Every structure is written in C-alpha cells, then in structure tokens.
Design a protein around this ligand. Structure first.
Ligand code: CL
Ligand code: CL
Lengths: 184, 184
C-alpha cells in the first residue's frame, strides 16, 4: 500500500502534466535508494517519497532529514529537488527544515491550495481504498493502474476478470464504484 | 538513559584524550539539533550521536542517513565528522553508507579492536547500569558524573548522600559496586 500511495500520487501528477515512474530503485553514490515516484516535467525531475499514516500523526523532522540525505545520494542521477507527500500534516520543524534545504512538501491540506485534498476533490476523484475490497483485490486493481473508482468503471467487468476477480466480484466492485461516484 | 549513554561515551573518550561536552543543542543552519556528545582532540571536533538498543537489533541505514543530514545542518559550527555509537551492530548497508560519506562508527564490537566492549574491558570498567538501582538513583549518580562502579566507590558514601541517597541506600550501592569490581 506504499504501492497504492505511490500509484495514487503518480496519477495526480500525471493529471498536472508530469511524466511518472513508480517504485524505482536507483544505485546511489553510496548505496541503493528507493524512490516512490520519479516525476518529470519541462526539464525538472523530482525524487518523490510518500510518508503516509493511518493515525492522525505528523510527518516530522527526522523523516525530512532522512529524505534530504536520500536526495543527496541520488542527486547525480539528475534530480532537481526531493518532494515528500503525506496524507496528514508536516510538523512545524519539518516545514522549516524543508523550506531551508529545498524539499518540496505536499500534505493533505498543505501547501495552501495544493494539498492532496485539493488534487483529489478538484477533479472529483475517489481512491479505490474507499471500496469494500481486500488487500489482494486492491493490489490487483492497482497493478492494472486502477487507483480511482472511475478507473474500475472504465476498466469494465471484462477487464476486472482478467486481472483476477470472479465474475461476481467484478460486478460487485463495479456497482460499489458507481454508487460512490453517484452518491456525493 | 540517552543521558547515561552520552555520559558513558564521553567518559570513554575522555580516557583517550578527548575534551567532551554532553547533551548539547546547537542552532543549525536550518533548525535546532541535539548532539549527544561533542568531542574534541588535537583540533578535530566530532558530532557524536548514540543510538543504543535494549534488544538485539541493528542500527541501520536510515539512522546513518538521518545522522549525516544532522551533521550537514551543524557543520558550520566547526565539526570535522559525525560519529555514531551503538551498543549493538551497524547493518552492512549502514557500514557501507558511512564509509562512503565519512561517518565514524563505533559499535559493541566494531571497528576491529575499537568497539565499546574493548573501550570498557581494556580498562576493567563496569557501567553502573549493572547495579540493582532504579532510574532515579541511576540518574542522580550520572548527574554527579558517576557512570562506572569505580566512580561509586571513589565518590564515597558521604557524597552519595548529598546527591540524594539515604545513608542505607548509599552503603548498599557502595557494597554492590565493590562486589562487582572484586567478582570478575
Ligand atoms: Cl473516481
Ligand atoms: Cl568500574
């Protein structure tokens, strides 16, 4: 589900004109480094890491500083800036450190006008995590690039069967996605 | 007890000709940073962090990379190199990253000939953590700079009373320390 997060983030950036690759390991100057999303547009290339939480806690200074060190180790591969996405908030210390070293930050509601809540809600997007589906079904959908309820609908029950859903489960998931989309 | 660790490490370095200060917060280029020990000798100045564990687990790459970022943020204050002490071992990834960015590492048994086990055992030192004492008694002793059993003995029951021990507890702790030292 860092797998889901990276795919959701790549998709949101693709909607804003970025070319993306997910879950990339590169050989750093020193050691191998995982990059959750590599995003490029108009000659800028970002090293993106997702740090999401399932409880209401901050992404803090230690995470920011780790991330900066990661960026330094991969920078020779042609990265403009590191960028952290979180689904909660950054601490004030993390915000300060980031502004001062040059880490872009996107939280649920940060920066003003550009948080994940805006990226999703401005397009009317609903992550498939809202659906009554298990981690297996979930992962199958994501691997097919299905990250939003709309993707389930436009994939179609035929395609959901290929990726591993029973006919019955495919019908149920499509109906659930339609209900979310029509129930706002 | 990061309080104890920093004091134990400073004392071991003082035995090897370093001038030390413990638990120092400095204003970094970006934000405040905690340094567990600042150690200097012959014009070299180290930023030391202790990462100890009470279970047999490695100090790993994330900790090393955090520490390197910390070093970069305080480096303008005149630090030669960062240095991590751990009471277990560093992972192979941490060792590799450290060698490649320039972080000194000292583990229980690393580097060869220079691990904490050697620093203690070569001088016949016994940390006071071996004694039947609580966190309060422990902290009192450490604040007085009492980190080894020998320090309890040379402090004397009179001094242990000043720092807060009852007469009875002072006698018991001295007897326990004598028993450790004579029981090797
Ligand atoms: Cl949707
Ligand atoms: Cl001793």
């Amino acid at each position: 589900n860092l797998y889901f997060q990276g795919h959701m983030v790549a998709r949101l950036l693709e909607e804003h004109g970025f070319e993306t690759k997910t879950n990339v390991i590169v050989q750093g100057n020193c050691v191998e480094q995982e990059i959750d999303v590599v995003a490029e547009r108009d000659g800028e290339r970002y090293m993106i890491e997702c740090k999401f939480h399932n409880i209401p806690v901050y992404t803090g200074l230690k995470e920011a500083m780790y991330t900066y060190a990661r960026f330094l180790d991969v920078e020779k591969h042609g990265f403009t800036q590191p960028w952290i996405f979180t689904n909660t908030k950054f601490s004030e210390e993390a915000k300060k450190y980031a502004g001062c070293v040059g880490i872009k930050l996107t939280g649920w509601s940060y920066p003003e006008k550009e948080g994940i809540e805006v990226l999703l809600e401005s397009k009317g997007l609903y992550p498939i995590t809202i659906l009554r589906i298990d981690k297996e079904v979930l992962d199958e959908l994501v691997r097919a690039g299905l990250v939003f309820c709309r993707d389930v609908v436009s994939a179609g029950e035929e395609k959901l069967r290929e990726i591993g859903l029973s006919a019955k489960k495919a019908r149920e998931v499509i109906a659930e996605a339609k209900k979310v989309i029509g129930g706002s």
